[PDB]
Write a protein that binds this DNA or RNA. Structure first.
Lengths: 87, 129
RNA sequence: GGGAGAAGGCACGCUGAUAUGUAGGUGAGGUCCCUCGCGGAUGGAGCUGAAAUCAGUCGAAGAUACCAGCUGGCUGCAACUGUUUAUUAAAAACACAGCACUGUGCAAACACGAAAGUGGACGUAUACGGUGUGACGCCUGCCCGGUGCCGGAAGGUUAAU
RNA sequence: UUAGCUAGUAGGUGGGGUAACGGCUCACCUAGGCGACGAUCCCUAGCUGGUCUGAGAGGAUGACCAGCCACACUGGAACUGAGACACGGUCCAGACUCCUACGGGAGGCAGCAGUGGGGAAUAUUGCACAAUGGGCGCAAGCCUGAUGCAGCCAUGCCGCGUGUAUGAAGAAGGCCUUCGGGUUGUAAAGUACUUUCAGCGGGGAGGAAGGGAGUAAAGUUAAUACCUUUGCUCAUUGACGUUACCCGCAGAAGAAGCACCGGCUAACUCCGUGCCAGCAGCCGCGGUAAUACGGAGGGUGCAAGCGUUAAUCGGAAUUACUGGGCGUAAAGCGCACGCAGGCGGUUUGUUAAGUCAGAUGUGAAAUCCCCGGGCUCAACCUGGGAACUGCAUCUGAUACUGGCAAGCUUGAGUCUCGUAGAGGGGGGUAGAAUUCCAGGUGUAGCGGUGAAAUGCGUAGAGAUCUGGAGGAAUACCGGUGGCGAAGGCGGCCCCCUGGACGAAGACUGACGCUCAGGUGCGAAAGCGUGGGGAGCAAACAGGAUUAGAUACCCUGGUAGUCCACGCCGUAAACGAUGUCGACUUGGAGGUUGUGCCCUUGAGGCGUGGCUUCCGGAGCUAACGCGUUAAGUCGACCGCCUGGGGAGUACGGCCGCAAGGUUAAAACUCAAAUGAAUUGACGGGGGCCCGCACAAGCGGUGGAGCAUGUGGUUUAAUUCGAUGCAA
RNA sequence: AAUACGUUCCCGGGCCUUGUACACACCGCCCGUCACACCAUGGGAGUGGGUUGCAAAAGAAGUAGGUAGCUUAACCUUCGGGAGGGCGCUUACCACUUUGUGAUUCAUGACUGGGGUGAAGUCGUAACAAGGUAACCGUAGGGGAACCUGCGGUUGGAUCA
RNA sequence: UUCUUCUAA
């Protein structure tokens, strides 16, 4: 913290990354349904969370949670994702 | 070892207040007297007694008020590793001006409120409050 | 250290100029010293003579003939130079420096010799003989029951006597 | 985890070249040039005014406006011209598209529209040069997809509505309920009033001023030709346009919706639902009574919008310049050396560099700020101001920091006498012990364990004495001792050698500190050759042990431990506290000096060095530290930034190797963590008690039957209790 | 009736004390192979791209230089020519393009290395108390697995007529 | 001397 050390080396402010990189700084991105299925969550909760494996515009293959209760989703379907993790 | 007599001086003032001593002595310098002749004038010490022939020794008298001390704070602004040169407009106000800031300009050593009325800035030594 | 001439690519004749011989090499007649000689300096005539540049110029092609490496990538095996089936087999075979074990105190061990004697060795354990392994790197586990070897001398067995 | 880079390179001379200077180009010399103040190489990028956030410091950012730059199918090149390497010029090569009678040609929206494409997503083959400009022309004019307009999107910022009063029967109805009521709710209904806007109908500025023609006079000239200048008339010029604004008209009319209510954070009930359906920024809700799911009611928040996602700062002091920390919560290199580096005692002059002050220049406009003005306000437009935190120049200033000289001695360093010491190497030398060998004596066990056993013994061990050999370590001293920077150093003697301290002095003149990179030292184990090998001892072997025992135990036993010379370079290398200063209450010691007082004995008064415990202030999250600071301040270096991943991967480096060293990322979690408190627990420690044990006696469990339970069976064997405490 | 010496041990309870990672509280917490499942990643015979160095080849257009040749309205002029220009010629430079060799980066890759994660498996129970062989650092060896053991160090360990 | 373990609200 001596200023000579501060002269020889600047304060490296830490660089943070996105947790949602597949959108690549976009609000929403178009996607293609690849597999629609359910998934049991981790220990404190017990459900069958409806979820779909998605091929995106940029070739990314991601999973994205189906909100709500009940849907009409097929594979090979055009959807749109907004973000947000599921805990 | 000896990187400053000034930071030696202010700390010997600082540790003498808490030690409740009446007389803090040290070897004297030309710049040391030029500061010590301000704080008597500004009313933060009572007496300084510069003596010594082969080597001048400055002996101070600490000002105490109502039992406790007068020097509530004593700092160092321009340290030897980092000097401070502020203009006449960037002169500070120690404790909203209630304390004083010792600045050395080309017109010797004075306080900041005198230096504002002198209208010329310089090197800020320390803060005394 | 190498691999590596890796690979790959460019130049190549002749004529003229540079410089009608250049760089260089050799080196007189001169000149001076000289203990004067089968001298020393100086001195450069002479001869001899590369290499390069530049500019021309000829062919389809100028290392023109003769002469004179095909290169690359992976892997087996042996480290290598070596040695060999004279006369169908040249290697992965052998040898090898290296490693390990073992024997041996000098009149050595051992070998050739009925013997004498000789090699060992005119060497003396950092020596010598034998066996196995075969550079270097990393290493080298378990079993002595068996077979050998070594050590033991209590007892059993037992020759000539 | 980019360290070397450069040959026209770098410089010169000469020639050439360009508007201009110059390897600009060439020739010839010279070998220079550059780089750790980051060259080089890689990745990304138009730059600034500004914009956004932030209290500021800063951070991010460059659409719109500007200033600059670059590009124009791609790659090239010149041309022309004052100005080009030319979006809408040429020429060549390419690609693609198109035409062709197949010989050939043509083509460039990153102009404005538009089409396709891509995409989460971004408008009309819109109109009009009236104004503002721009090009040409004497003018008139001509052109302008520059420009002014309209459409298009709640894209954003503003301004405005969707009425106002009254109205309790607290209506109906809804919801809820203690069934009493409550709430919706003055809300609506009703009553009176208002007509903004939109609509309709009618009226009606500014942007149109200039200029244009006809005219008059003056100037100019021979001119009253012309022309120029200044007055006068005729006409104008509007795309927007049905403008801005003004009156009628009619009625409450035509005009409100999203999000939210578990806490965080403003606002709850009811019902469905039952770890399902789901919810979810975080903590977390749902496993039959959910304020967290879904619905309803009610309420909260906003509003022509409301939400979600994206994206940036803030909060975040969470990189701490402002404004952090490193004893244990992440973090001080294992120490020492030392260059560059940064930092500097004291005093005098000098210098005026830094610094400060003043003055000039510039810091474009816009923007922001301040004071105004204009649009009915506001948004917006705009006047003036300040500001633009700078830089350049000039004039000062002299305290400090430098620069330059001179000094001084406190810092620092010598000289002089001594002092203590496991400080270092080198070579000896002892004495016990152990082992081994040999012998005497002697006899039946020895050894080991919890028990044993493996083992060793009658082939005479063990034991005992005597002799000899070998390696290794050096009892007691010995010490919360000593020395060394640490790592560390332990018999004695000798040889060589280091460091420290003290004492009186003498001298030197600041000679100082820290130190990236570098250099050395650096435990143990390990490595390499050699040696040596008593004891001990990984591995290994046997014996136990146990459910198992690759362990703990036993009996063995090899590397290894020792030496010589080299490699490795890590240790909880710890005081988990980097080095050198200065200040700041004490007490009790240890060790080592050195004065004084009669040593009046092992005494007292001093004065040093080092070290141990305690502990005041102070500090600390506490614990603690506490003059040897974890107190107060100085200088410089090293390091830290949630946990796992991980000091790992991948490269480099070094090494014989082992590895050392440098050092991530993906992914994952909402914890990890430190001290300290209260309990609990301990195959932890004390103290006490109980038919708890021990001391006793009788039983149960064997037998038969009674009774109850389990199980089985039944049409049903009703249900409940089910360690102790059924 | 018998018997009680006694408090060593056993069972339980209380008290002080210490340790402590325990706190629905030692019937506690806790670890690592292995089995399964999920997630990203290292390595990897290779494979396919991108970018770029390097060495040369390449020579359109263009311009500049030279120019045998053909040619040539102003100007000189004896009228013959003079210079110049044109065209072609060649030279210089250089685009397109080619060759080899590297480098770098992305994608992919049989297989293989660990890592992290599990509301139930299997094996053992190492650490937390003296965790029942104190714990841990180095380093070495061994071993299904936590681990074990040797040497050295640390206390960030309990015990005490 | 020996002595191990207690799933998921």
């Amino acid at each position: 913290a001596t200023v000579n050390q501060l002269v020889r080396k600047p304060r490296a402010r830490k660089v943070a990354k996105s947790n949602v990189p597949a959108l690549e700084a976009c609000p929403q991105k178009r996607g293609v349904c690849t597999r629609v299925y359910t998934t049991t969550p981790k220990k404190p909760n017990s459900a069958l969370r409806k979820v779909c494996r998605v091929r995106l515009t940029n070739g990314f293959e991601v999973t994205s949670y189906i909100g709500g209760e009940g849907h009409n989703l097929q594979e090979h379907s055009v959807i749109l994702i907004r973000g947000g993790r599921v805990k | 070892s000896m990187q400053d007599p000034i930071a030696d001086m202010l700390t010997r003032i600082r540790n003498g207040q808490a030690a409740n001593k009446a007389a803090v002595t040290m070897p004297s310098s030309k710049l040391k007297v030029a500061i010590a002749n301000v704080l008597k004038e500004e009313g933060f010490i009572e007496d300084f007694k510069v003596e010594g022939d082969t080597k001048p020794e400055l002996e101070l008298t600490l000002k105490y008020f109502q039992g406790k001390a007068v020097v509530e704070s004593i700092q160092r602004v321009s340290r030897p590793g980092l000097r401070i040169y502020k203009r006449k407009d960037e002169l500070p106000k120690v404790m909203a001006g209630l304390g004083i800031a010792v600045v050395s300009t080309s017109k010797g050593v004075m306080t900041d409120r005198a230096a504002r009325q002198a209208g010329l800035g310089g090197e800020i030594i320390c803060y005394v409050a």
